mmCIF file with all atom_site columns, all heavy atoms in Angstrom:
data_model
loop_
_atom_site.group_PDB
_atom_site.id
_atom_site.type_symbol
_atom_site.label_atom_id
_atom_site.label_alt_id
_atom_site.label_comp_id
_atom_site.label_asym_id
_atom_site.label_entity_id
_atom_site.label_seq_id
_atom_site.pdbx_PDB_ins_code
_atom_site.Cartn_x
_atom_site.Cartn_y
_atom_site.Cartn_z
_atom_site.occupancy
_atom_site.B_iso_or_equiv
_atom_site.pdbx_formal_charge
_atom_site.auth_seq_id
_atom_site.auth_comp_id
_atom_site.auth_asym_id
_atom_site.auth_atom_id
_atom_site.pdbx_PDB_model_num
ATOM 1   N N   . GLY A 1 1  ? 133.867 39.239 38.942 1.00 14.55 ? 48 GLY A N   1
ATOM 2   C CA  . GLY A 1 1  ? 132.437 39.114 38.842 1.00 14.55 ? 48 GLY A CA  1
ATOM 3   C C   . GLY A 1 1  ? 131.707 38.874 40.148 1.00 14.55 ? 48 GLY A C   1
ATOM 4   O O   . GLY A 1 1  ? 132.294 38.823 41.252 1.00 14.55 ? 48 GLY A O   1
ATOM 5   N N   . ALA A 1 2  ? 130.387 38.749 40.039 1.00 17.44 ? 49 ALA A N   1
ATOM 6   C CA  . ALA A 1 2  ? 129.539 38.515 41.173 1.00 17.44 ? 49 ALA A CA  1
ATOM 7   C C   . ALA A 1 2  ? 128.417 37.583 40.755 1.00 17.44 ? 49 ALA A C   1
ATOM 8   O O   . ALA A 1 2  ? 127.913 37.696 39.660 1.00 17.44 ? 49 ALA A O   1
ATOM 9   C CB  . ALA A 1 2  ? 128.980 39.843 41.712 1.00 17.44 ? 49 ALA A CB  1
ATOM 10  N N   . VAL A 1 3  ? 128.049 36.683 41.648 1.00 15.12 ? 50 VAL A N   1
ATOM 11  C CA  . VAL A 1 3  ? 127.021 35.684 41.434 1.00 15.12 ? 50 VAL A CA  1
ATOM 12  C C   . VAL A 1 3  ? 125.883 35.792 42.466 1.00 15.12 ? 50 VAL A C   1
ATOM 13  O O   . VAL A 1 3  ? 126.127 35.773 43.695 1.00 15.12 ? 50 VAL A O   1
ATOM 14  C CB  . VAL A 1 3  ? 127.620 34.269 41.553 1.00 15.12 ? 50 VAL A CB  1
ATOM 15  C CG1 . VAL A 1 3  ? 126.478 33.260 41.321 1.00 15.12 ? 50 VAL A CG1 1
ATOM 16  C CG2 . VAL A 1 3  ? 128.795 34.071 40.596 1.00 15.12 ? 50 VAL A CG2 1
ATOM 17  N N   . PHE A 1 4  ? 124.648 35.937 41.971 1.00 14.53 ? 51 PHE A N   1
ATOM 18  C CA  . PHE A 1 4  ? 123.476 36.005 42.809 1.00 14.53 ? 51 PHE A CA  1
ATOM 19  C C   . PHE A 1 4  ? 122.903 34.621 42.877 1.00 14.53 ? 51 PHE A C   1
ATOM 20  O O   . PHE A 1 4  ? 122.534 34.058 41.807 1.00 14.53 ? 51 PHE A O   1
ATOM 21  C CB  . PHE A 1 4  ? 122.465 36.994 42.242 1.00 14.53 ? 51 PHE A CB  1
ATOM 22  C CG  . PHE A 1 4  ? 122.963 38.354 42.277 1.00 14.53 ? 51 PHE A CG  1
ATOM 23  C CD1 . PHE A 1 4  ? 123.794 38.797 41.249 1.00 14.53 ? 51 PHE A CD1 1
ATOM 24  C CD2 . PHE A 1 4  ? 122.749 39.191 43.386 1.00 14.53 ? 51 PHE A CD2 1
ATOM 25  C CE1 . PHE A 1 4  ? 124.345 40.101 41.290 1.00 14.53 ? 51 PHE A CE1 1
ATOM 26  C CE2 . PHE A 1 4  ? 123.272 40.476 43.397 1.00 14.53 ? 51 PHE A CE2 1
ATOM 27  C CZ  . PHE A 1 4  ? 124.104 40.912 42.360 1.00 14.53 ? 51 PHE A CZ  1
ATOM 28  N N   . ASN A 1 5  ? 122.822 34.072 44.087 1.00 18.02 ? 52 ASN A N   1
ATOM 29  C CA  . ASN A 1 5  ? 122.365 32.694 44.242 1.00 18.02 ? 52 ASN A CA  1
ATOM 30  C C   . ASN A 1 5  ? 120.825 32.653 44.236 1.00 18.02 ? 52 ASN A C   1
ATOM 31  O O   . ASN A 1 5  ? 120.201 32.948 45.258 1.00 18.02 ? 52 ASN A O   1
ATOM 32  C CB  . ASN A 1 5  ? 122.904 32.018 45.508 1.00 18.02 ? 52 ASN A CB  1
ATOM 33  C CG  . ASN A 1 5  ? 122.628 30.531 45.531 1.00 18.02 ? 52 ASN A CG  1
ATOM 34  O OD1 . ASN A 1 5  ? 121.643 30.054 44.901 1.00 18.02 ? 52 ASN A OD1 1
ATOM 35  N ND2 . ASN A 1 5  ? 123.530 29.763 46.185 1.00 18.02 ? 52 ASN A ND2 1
ATOM 36  N N   . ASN A 1 6  ? 120.245 32.323 43.071 1.00 18.40 ? 53 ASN A N   1
ATOM 37  C CA  . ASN A 1 6  ? 118.811 32.212 42.902 1.00 18.40 ? 53 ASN A CA  1
ATOM 38  C C   . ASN A 1 6  ? 118.462 30.742 42.592 1.00 18.40 ? 53 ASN A C   1
ATOM 39  O O   . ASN A 1 6  ? 117.527 30.437 41.860 1.00 18.40 ? 53 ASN A O   1
ATOM 40  C CB  . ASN A 1 6  ? 118.276 33.141 41.787 1.00 18.40 ? 53 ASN A CB  1
ATOM 41  C CG  . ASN A 1 6  ? 116.806 33.391 41.885 1.00 18.40 ? 53 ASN A CG  1
ATOM 42  O OD1 . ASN A 1 6  ? 116.258 33.426 42.974 1.00 18.40 ? 53 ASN A OD1 1
ATOM 43  N ND2 . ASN A 1 6  ? 116.159 33.552 40.755 1.00 18.40 ? 53 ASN A ND2 1
ATOM 44  N N   . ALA A 1 7  ? 119.187 29.847 43.235 1.00 22.39 ? 54 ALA A N   1
ATOM 45  C CA  . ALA A 1 7  ? 119.044 28.409 42.996 1.00 22.39 ? 54 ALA A CA  1
ATOM 46  C C   . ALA A 1 7  ? 118.288 27.649 44.066 1.00 22.39 ? 54 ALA A C   1
ATOM 47  O O   . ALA A 1 7  ? 118.452 27.854 45.279 1.00 22.39 ? 54 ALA A O   1
ATOM 48  C CB  . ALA A 1 7  ? 120.425 27.784 42.808 1.00 22.39 ? 54 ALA A CB  1
ATOM 49  N N   . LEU A 1 8  ? 117.408 26.771 43.590 1.00 20.40 ? 55 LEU A N   1
ATOM 50  C CA  . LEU A 1 8  ? 116.687 25.807 44.417 1.00 20.40 ? 55 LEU A CA  1
ATOM 51  C C   . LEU A 1 8  ? 117.439 24.449 44.565 1.00 20.40 ? 55 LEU A C   1
ATOM 52  O O   . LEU A 1 8  ? 117.154 23.642 45.508 1.00 20.40 ? 55 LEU A O   1
ATOM 53  C CB  . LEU A 1 8  ? 115.337 25.565 43.768 1.00 20.40 ? 55 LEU A CB  1
ATOM 54  C CG  . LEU A 1 8  ? 114.428 26.788 43.629 1.00 20.40 ? 55 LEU A CG  1
ATOM 55  C CD1 . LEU A 1 8  ? 113.084 26.449 42.945 1.00 20.40 ? 55 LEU A CD1 1
ATOM 56  C CD2 . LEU A 1 8  ? 114.207 27.389 44.995 1.00 20.40 ? 55 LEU A CD2 1
ATOM 57  N N   . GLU A 1 9  ? 118.364 24.215 43.640 1.00 19.51 ? 56 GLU A N   1
ATOM 58  C CA  . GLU A 1 9  ? 119.249 23.037 43.658 1.00 19.51 ? 56 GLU A CA  1
ATOM 59  C C   . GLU A 1 9  ? 120.691 23.425 43.497 1.00 19.51 ? 56 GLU A C   1
ATOM 60  O O   . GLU A 1 9  ? 120.990 24.367 42.769 1.00 19.51 ? 56 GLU A O   1
ATOM 61  C CB  . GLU A 1 9  ? 118.955 22.189 42.429 1.00 19.51 ? 56 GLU A CB  1
ATOM 62  C CG  . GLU A 1 9  ? 117.597 21.563 42.421 1.00 19.51 ? 56 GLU A CG  1
ATOM 63  C CD  . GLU A 1 9  ? 117.216 21.051 41.034 1.00 19.51 ? 56 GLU A CD  1
ATOM 64  O OE1 . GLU A 1 9  ? 118.058 20.405 40.374 1.00 19.51 ? 56 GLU A OE1 1
ATOM 65  O OE2 . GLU A 1 9  ? 116.068 21.314 40.603 1.00 19.51 ? 56 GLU A OE2 1
ATOM 66  N N   . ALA A 1 10 ? 121.593 22.611 44.036 1.00 17.68 ? 57 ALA A N   1
ATOM 67  C CA  . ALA A 1 10 ? 123.040 22.843 43.870 1.00 17.68 ? 57 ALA A CA  1
ATOM 68  C C   . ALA A 1 10 ? 123.419 22.630 42.424 1.00 17.68 ? 57 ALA A C   1
ATOM 69  O O   . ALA A 1 10 ? 122.766 21.898 41.702 1.00 17.68 ? 57 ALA A O   1
ATOM 70  C CB  . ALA A 1 10 ? 123.835 21.891 44.797 1.00 17.68 ? 57 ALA A CB  1
ATOM 71  N N   . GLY A 1 11 ? 124.482 23.292 42.003 1.00 16.35 ? 58 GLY A N   1
ATOM 72  C CA  . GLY A 1 11 ? 125.047 23.083 40.706 1.00 16.35 ? 58 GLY A CA  1
ATOM 73  C C   . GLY A 1 11 ? 126.253 23.964 40.473 1.00 16.35 ? 58 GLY A C   1
ATOM 74  O O   . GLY A 1 11 ? 126.844 24.500 41.430 1.00 16.35 ? 58 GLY A O   1
ATOM 75  N N   . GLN A 1 12 ? 126.640 24.075 39.197 1.00 19.20 ? 59 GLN A N   1
ATOM 76  C CA  . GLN A 1 12 ? 127.857 24.782 38.753 1.00 19.20 ? 59 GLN A CA  1
ATOM 77  C C   . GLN A 1 12 ? 127.475 26.180 38.286 1.00 19.20 ? 59 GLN A C   1
ATOM 78  O O   . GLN A 1 12 ? 126.663 26.367 37.372 1.00 19.20 ? 59 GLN A O   1
ATOM 79  C CB  . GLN A 1 12 ? 128.514 24.018 37.593 1.00 19.20 ? 59 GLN A CB  1
ATOM 80  C CG  . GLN A 1 12 ? 129.131 22.731 37.951 1.00 19.20 ? 59 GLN A CG  1
ATOM 81  C CD  . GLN A 1 12 ? 130.170 22.888 39.024 1.00 19.20 ? 59 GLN A CD  1
ATOM 82  O OE1 . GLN A 1 12 ? 130.969 23.831 38.992 1.00 19.20 ? 59 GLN A OE1 1
ATOM 83  N NE2 . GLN A 1 12 ? 130.148 21.985 39.999 1.00 19.20 ? 59 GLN A NE2 1
ATOM 84  N N   . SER A 1 13 ? 128.038 27.206 38.914 1.00 19.25 ? 60 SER A N   1
ATOM 85  C CA  . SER A 1 13 ? 127.864 28.536 38.388 1.00 19.25 ? 60 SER A CA  1
ATOM 86  C C   . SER A 1 13 ? 128.938 28.783 37.318 1.00 19.25 ? 60 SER A C   1
ATOM 87  O O   . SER A 1 13 ? 129.978 28.163 37.337 1.00 19.25 ? 60 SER A O   1
ATOM 88  C CB  . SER A 1 13 ? 127.957 29.550 39.514 1.00 19.25 ? 60 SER A CB  1
ATOM 89  O OG  . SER A 1 13 ? 129.247 29.608 40.043 1.00 19.25 ? 60 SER A OG  1
ATOM 90  N N   . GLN A 1 14 ? 128.704 29.716 36.421 1.00 19.59 ? 61 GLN A N   1
ATOM 91  C CA  . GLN A 1 14 ? 129.775 30.168 35.520 1.00 19.59 ? 61 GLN A CA  1
ATOM 92  C C   . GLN A 1 14 ? 130.957 30.867 36.190 1.00 19.59 ? 61 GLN A C   1
ATOM 93  O O   . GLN A 1 14 ? 132.106 30.585 35.867 1.00 19.59 ? 61 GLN A O   1
ATOM 94  C CB  . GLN A 1 14 ? 129.173 31.067 34.468 1.00 19.59 ? 61 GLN A CB  1
ATOM 95  C CG  . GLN A 1 14 ? 128.181 30.322 33.563 1.00 19.59 ? 61 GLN A CG  1
ATOM 96  C CD  . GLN A 1 14 ? 127.733 31.136 32.356 1.00 19.59 ? 61 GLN A CD  1
ATOM 97  O OE1 . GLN A 1 14 ? 128.518 31.904 31.782 1.00 19.59 ? 61 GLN A OE1 1
ATOM 98  N NE2 . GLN A 1 14 ? 126.458 30.969 31.974 1.00 19.59 ? 61 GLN A NE2 1
ATOM 99  N N   . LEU A 1 15 ? 130.699 31.754 37.147 1.00 20.00 ? 62 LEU A N   1
ATOM 100 C CA  . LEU A 1 15 ? 131.754 32.617 37.673 1.00 20.00 ? 62 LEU A CA  1
ATOM 101 C C   . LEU A 1 15 ? 132.374 32.117 38.964 1.00 20.00 ? 62 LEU A C   1
ATOM 102 O O   . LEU A 1 15 ? 133.492 32.533 39.307 1.00 20.00 ? 62 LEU A O   1
ATOM 103 C CB  . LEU A 1 15 ? 131.231 34.031 37.902 1.00 20.00 ? 62 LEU A CB  1
ATOM 104 C CG  . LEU A 1 15 ? 130.621 34.735 36.692 1.00 20.00 ? 62 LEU A CG  1
ATOM 105 C CD1 . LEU A 1 15 ? 130.170 36.103 37.066 1.00 20.00 ? 62 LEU A CD1 1
ATOM 106 C CD2 . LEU A 1 15 ? 131.592 34.766 35.466 1.00 20.00 ? 62 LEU A CD2 1
ATOM 107 N N   . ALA A 1 16 ? 131.678 31.269 39.694 1.00 19.61 ? 63 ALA A N   1
ATOM 108 C CA  . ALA A 1 16 ? 132.095 30.911 41.061 1.00 19.61 ? 63 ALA A CA  1
ATOM 109 C C   . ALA A 1 16 ? 132.194 29.426 41.368 1.00 19.61 ? 63 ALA A C   1
ATOM 110 O O   . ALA A 1 16 ? 132.288 29.057 42.527 1.00 19.61 ? 63 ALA A O   1
ATOM 111 C CB  . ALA A 1 16 ? 131.162 31.561 42.067 1.00 19.61 ? 63 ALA A CB  1
ATOM 112 N N   . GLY A 1 17 ? 132.132 28.581 40.360 1.00 19.19 ? 64 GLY A N   1
ATOM 113 C CA  . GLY A 1 17 ? 132.202 27.158 40.574 1.00 19.19 ? 64 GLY A CA  1
ATOM 114 C C   . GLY A 1 17 ? 130.970 26.632 41.263 1.00 19.19 ? 64 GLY A C   1
ATOM 115 O O   . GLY A 1 17 ? 129.914 27.198 41.156 1.00 19.19 ? 64 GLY A O   1
ATOM 116 N N   . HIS A 1 18 ? 131.134 25.541 41.987 1.00 17.29 ? 65 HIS A N   1
ATOM 117 C CA  . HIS A 1 18 ? 130.001 24.860 42.581 1.00 17.29 ? 65 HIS A CA  1
ATOM 118 C C   . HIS A 1 18 ? 129.393 25.620 43.720 1.00 17.29 ? 65 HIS A C   1
ATOM 119 O O   . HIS A 1 18 ? 130.113 26.027 44.637 1.00 17.29 ? 65 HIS A O   1
ATOM 120 C CB  . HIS A 1 18 ? 130.415 23.499 43.080 1.00 17.29 ? 65 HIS A CB  1
ATOM 121 C CG  . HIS A 1 18 ? 129.270 22.666 43.528 1.00 17.29 ? 65 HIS A CG  1
ATOM 122 N ND1 . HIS A 1 18 ? 128.862 22.617 44.849 1.00 17.29 ? 65 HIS A ND1 1
ATOM 123 C CD2 . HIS A 1 18 ? 128.428 21.868 42.837 1.00 17.29 ? 65 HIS A CD2 1
ATOM 124 C CE1 . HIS A 1 18 ? 127.842 21.783 44.951 1.00 17.29 ? 65 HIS A CE1 1
ATOM 125 N NE2 . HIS A 1 18 ? 127.558 21.319 43.742 1.00 17.29 ? 65 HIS A NE2 1
ATOM 126 N N   . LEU A 1 19 ? 128.075 25.772 43.665 1.00 16.46 ? 66 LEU A N   1
ATOM 127 C CA  . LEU A 1 19 ? 127.287 26.374 44.757 1.00 16.46 ? 66 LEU A CA  1
ATOM 128 C C   . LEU A 1 19 ? 126.143 25.502 45.190 1.00 16.46 ? 66 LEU A C   1
ATOM 129 O O   . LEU A 1 19 ? 125.552 24.776 44.403 1.00 16.46 ? 66 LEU A O   1
ATOM 130 C CB  . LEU A 1 19 ? 126.756 27.745 44.362 1.00 16.46 ? 66 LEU A CB  1
ATOM 131 C CG  . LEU A 1 19 ? 127.844 28.771 44.026 1.00 16.46 ? 66 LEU A CG  1
ATOM 132 C CD1 . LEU A 1 19 ? 127.230 30.006 43.381 1.00 16.46 ? 66 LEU A CD1 1
ATOM 133 C CD2 . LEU A 1 19 ? 128.670 29.205 45.211 1.00 16.46 ? 66 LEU A CD2 1
ATOM 134 N N   . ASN A 1 20 ? 125.873 25.526 46.483 1.00 16.85 ? 67 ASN A N   1
ATOM 135 C CA  . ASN A 1 20 ? 124.708 24.907 47.012 1.00 16.85 ? 67 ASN A CA  1
ATOM 136 C C   . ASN A 1 20 ? 123.499 25.789 46.714 1.00 16.85 ? 67 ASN A C   1
ATOM 137 O O   . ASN A 1 20 ? 123.642 26.957 46.288 1.00 16.85 ? 67 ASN A O   1
ATOM 138 C CB  . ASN A 1 20 ? 124.871 24.719 48.501 1.00 16.85 ? 67 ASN A CB  1
ATOM 139 C CG  . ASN A 1 20 ? 125.940 23.679 48.872 1.00 16.85 ? 67 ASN A CG  1
ATOM 140 O OD1 . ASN A 1 20 ? 126.282 22.791 48.084 1.00 16.85 ? 67 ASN A OD1 1
ATOM 141 N ND2 . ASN A 1 20 ? 126.502 23.826 50.048 1.00 16.85 ? 67 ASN A ND2 1
ATOM 142 N N   . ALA A 1 21 ? 122.316 25.242 46.938 1.00 19.57 ? 68 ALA A N   1
ATOM 143 C CA  . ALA A 1 21 ? 121.047 26.016 46.837 1.00 19.57 ? 68 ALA A CA  1
ATOM 144 C C   . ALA A 1 21 ? 121.035 27.154 47.808 1.00 19.57 ? 68 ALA A C   1
ATOM 145 O O   . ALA A 1 21 ? 121.736 27.141 48.812 1.00 19.57 ? 68 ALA A O   1
ATOM 146 C CB  . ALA A 1 21 ? 119.845 25.152 47.061 1.00 19.57 ? 68 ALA A CB  1
ATOM 147 N N   . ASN A 1 22 ? 120.271 28.185 47.486 1.00 17.98 ? 69 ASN A N   1
ATOM 148 C CA  . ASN A 1 22 ? 120.046 29.261 48.411 1.00 17.98 ? 69 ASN A CA  1
ATOM 149 C C   . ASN A 1 22 ? 118.828 28.846 49.279 1.00 17.98 ? 69 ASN A C   1
ATOM 150 O O   . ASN A 1 22 ? 117.670 28.886 48.815 1.00 17.98 ? 69 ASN A O   1
ATOM 151 C CB  . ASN A 1 22 ? 119.720 30.534 47.645 1.00 17.98 ? 69 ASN A CB  1
ATOM 152 C CG  . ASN A 1 22 ? 119.470 31.680 48.528 1.00 17.98 ? 69 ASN A CG  1
ATOM 153 O OD1 . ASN A 1 22 ? 119.294 31.502 49.744 1.00 17.98 ? 69 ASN A OD1 1
ATOM 154 N ND2 . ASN A 1 22 ? 119.395 32.890 47.948 1.00 17.98 ? 69 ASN A ND2 1
ATOM 155 N N   . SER A 1 23 ? 119.128 28.471 50.517 1.00 17.04 ? 70 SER A N   1
ATOM 156 C CA  . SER A 1 23 ? 118.138 27.994 51.500 1.00 17.04 ? 70 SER A CA  1
ATOM 157 C C   . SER A 1 23 ? 117.111 29.047 51.891 1.00 17.04 ? 70 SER A C   1
ATOM 158 O O   . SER A 1 23 ? 116.136 28.732 52.576 1.00 17.04 ? 70 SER A O   1
ATOM 159 C CB  . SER A 1 23 ? 118.853 27.468 52.766 1.00 17.04 ? 70 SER A CB  1
ATOM 160 O OG  . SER A 1 23 ? 119.766 28.403 53.337 1.00 17.04 ? 70 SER A OG  1
ATOM 161 N N   . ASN A 1 24 ? 117.332 30.293 51.474 1.00 15.95 ? 71 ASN A N   1
ATOM 162 C CA  . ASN A 1 24 ? 116.353 31.409 51.704 1.00 15.95 ? 71 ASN A CA  1
ATOM 163 C C   . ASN A 1 24 ? 115.209 31.331 50.737 1.00 15.95 ? 71 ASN A C   1
ATOM 164 O O   . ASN A 1 24 ? 114.234 32.056 50.891 1.00 15.95 ? 71 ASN A O   1
ATOM 165 C CB  . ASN A 1 24 ? 116.934 32.796 51.463 1.00 15.95 ? 71 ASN A CB  1
ATOM 166 C CG  . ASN A 1 24 ? 117.954 33.155 52.405 1.00 15.95 ? 71 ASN A CG  1
ATOM 167 O OD1 . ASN A 1 24 ? 118.774 34.047 52.159 1.00 15.95 ? 71 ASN A OD1 1
ATOM 168 N ND2 . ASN A 1 24 ? 117.947 32.472 53.510 1.00 15.95 ? 71 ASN A ND2 1
ATOM 169 N N   . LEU A 1 25 ? 115.350 30.512 49.710 1.00 15.39 ? 72 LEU A N   1
ATOM 170 C CA  . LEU A 1 25 ? 114.310 30.376 48.723 1.00 15.39 ? 72 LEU A CA  1
ATOM 171 C C   . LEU A 1 25 ? 113.359 29.290 49.201 1.00 15.39 ? 72 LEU A C   1
ATOM 172 O O   . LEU A 1 25 ? 113.387 28.127 48.734 1.00 15.39 ? 72 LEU A O   1
ATOM 173 C CB  . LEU A 1 25 ? 114.899 30.074 47.356 1.00 15.39 ? 72 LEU A CB  1
ATOM 174 C CG  . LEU A 1 25 ? 115.940 31.112 46.937 1.00 15.39 ? 72 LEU A CG  1
ATOM 175 C CD1 . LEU A 1 25 ? 116.421 30.726 45.576 1.00 15.39 ? 72 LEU A CD1 1
ATOM 176 C CD2 . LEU A 1 25 ? 115.407 32.550 46.970 1.00 15.39 ? 72 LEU A CD2 1
ATOM 177 N N   . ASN A 1 26 ? 112.555 29.686 50.184 1.00 16.16 ? 73 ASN A N   1
ATOM 178 C CA  . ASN A 1 26 ? 111.431 28.888 50.642 1.00 16.16 ? 73 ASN A CA  1
ATOM 179 C C   . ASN A 1 26 ? 110.817 28.113 49.490 1.00 16.16 ? 73 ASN A C   1
ATOM 180 O O   . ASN A 1 26 ? 109.609 28.097 49.325 1.00 16.16 ? 73 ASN A O   1
ATOM 181 C CB  . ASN A 1 26 ? 110.368 29.801 51.278 1.00 16.16 ? 73 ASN A CB  1
ATOM 182 C CG  . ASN A 1 26 ? 110.895 30.564 52.478 1.00 16.16 ? 73 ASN A CG  1
ATOM 183 O OD1 . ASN A 1 26 ? 111.969 30.194 52.971 1.00 16.16 ? 73 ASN A OD1 1
ATOM 184 N ND2 . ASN A 1 26 ? 110.233 31.521 52.957 1.00 16.16 ? 73 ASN A ND2 1
ATOM 185 N N   . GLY A 1 27 ? 111.651 27.478 48.680 1.00 15.26 ? 74 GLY A N   1
ATOM 186 C CA  . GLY A 1 27 ? 111.144 26.661 47.576 1.00 15.26 ? 74 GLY A CA  1
ATOM 187 C C   . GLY A 1 27 ? 110.666 27.409 46.340 1.00 15.26 ? 74 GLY A C   1
ATOM 188 O O   . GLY A 1 27 ? 110.220 26.768 45.381 1.00 15.26 ? 74 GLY A O   1
ATOM 189 N N   . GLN A 1 28 ? 110.735 28.749 46.361 1.00 14.77 ? 75 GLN A N   1
ATOM 190 C CA  . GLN A 1 28 ? 110.399 29.601 45.175 1.00 14.77 ? 75 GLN A CA  1
ATOM 191 C C   . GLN A 1 28 ? 111.537 30.592 44.916 1.00 14.77 ? 75 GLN A C   1
ATOM 192 O O   . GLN A 1 28 ? 111.876 31.362 45.808 1.00 14.77 ? 75 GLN A O   1
ATOM 193 C CB  . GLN A 1 28 ? 109.059 30.364 45.368 1.00 14.77 ? 75 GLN A CB  1
ATOM 194 C CG  . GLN A 1 28 ? 108.943 31.803 44.763 1.00 14.77 ? 75 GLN A CG  1
ATOM 195 C CD  . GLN A 1 28 ? 107.528 32.195 44.289 1.00 14.77 ? 75 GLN A CD  1
ATOM 196 O OE1 . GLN A 1 28 ? 106.932 31.456 43.547 1.00 14.77 ? 75 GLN A OE1 1
ATOM 197 N NE2 . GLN A 1 28 ? 107.023 33.389 44.688 1.00 14.77 ? 75 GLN A NE2 1
ATOM 198 N N   . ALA A 1 29 ? 112.073 30.601 43.691 1.00 18.46 ? 76 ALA A N   1
ATOM 199 C CA  . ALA A 1 29 ? 113.169 31.523 43.351 1.00 18.46 ? 76 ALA A CA  1
ATOM 200 C C   . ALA A 1 29 ? 112.598 32.922 43.143 1.00 18.46 ? 76 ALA A C   1
ATOM 201 O O   . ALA A 1 29 ? 111.409 33.105 42.907 1.00 18.46 ? 76 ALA A O   1
ATOM 202 C CB  . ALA A 1 29 ? 113.871 31.077 42.109 1.00 18.46 ? 76 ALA A CB  1
ATOM 203 N N   . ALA A 1 30 ? 113.462 33.898 43.195 1.00 16.87 ? 77 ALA A N   1
ATOM 204 C CA  . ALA A 1 30 ? 113.057 35.271 42.951 1.00 16.87 ? 77 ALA A CA  1
ATOM 205 C C   . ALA A 1 30 ? 112.652 35.461 41.478 1.00 16.87 ? 77 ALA A C   1
ATOM 206 O O   . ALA A 1 30 ? 113.288 34.902 40.599 1.00 16.87 ? 77 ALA A O   1
ATOM 207 C CB  . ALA A 1 30 ? 114.162 36.177 43.335 1.00 16.87 ? 77 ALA A CB  1
ATOM 208 N N   . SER A 1 31 ? 111.575 36.187 41.226 1.00 16.26 ? 78 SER A N   1
ATOM 209 C CA  . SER A 1 31 ? 111.274 36.663 39.876 1.00 16.26 ? 78 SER A CA  1
ATOM 210 C C   . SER A 1 31 ? 112.083 37.884 39.537 1.00 16.26 ? 78 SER A C   1
ATOM 211 O O   . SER A 1 31 ? 112.385 38.105 38.364 1.00 16.26 ? 78 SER A O   1
ATOM 212 C CB  . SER A 1 31 ? 109.778 37.021 39.775 1.00 16.26 ? 78 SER A CB  1
ATOM 213 O OG  . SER A 1 31 ? 109.037 35.849 40.055 1.00 16.26 ? 78 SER A OG  1
ATOM 214 N N   . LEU A 1 32 ? 112.308 38.757 40.535 1.00 17.42 ? 79 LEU A N   1
ATOM 215 C CA  . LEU A 1 32 ? 113.092 40.002 40.371 1.00 17.42 ? 79 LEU A CA  1
ATOM 216 C C   . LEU A 1 32 ? 114.068 40.108 41.500 1.00 17.42 ? 79 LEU A C   1
ATOM 217 O O   . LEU A 1 32 ? 113.669 39.894 42.648 1.00 17.42 ? 79 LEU A O   1
ATOM 218 C CB  . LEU A 1 32 ? 112.166 41.226 40.439 1.00 17.42 ? 79 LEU A CB  1
ATOM 219 C CG  . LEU A 1 32 ? 112.830 42.608 40.517 1.00 17.42 ? 79 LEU A CG  1
ATOM 220 C CD1 . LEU A 1 32 ? 113.753 42.909 39.340 1.00 17.42 ? 79 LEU A CD1 1
ATOM 221 C CD2 . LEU A 1 32 ? 111.802 43.726 40.738 1.00 17.42 ? 79 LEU A CD2 1
#
């Protein structure tokens, strides 16, 4: 699988375990 990091906070993904926030999200996640 593949995981797209659209997170503002760290947490548990289904496919990839623990991930940090995506720091590219200037505080707003992608709509698309």
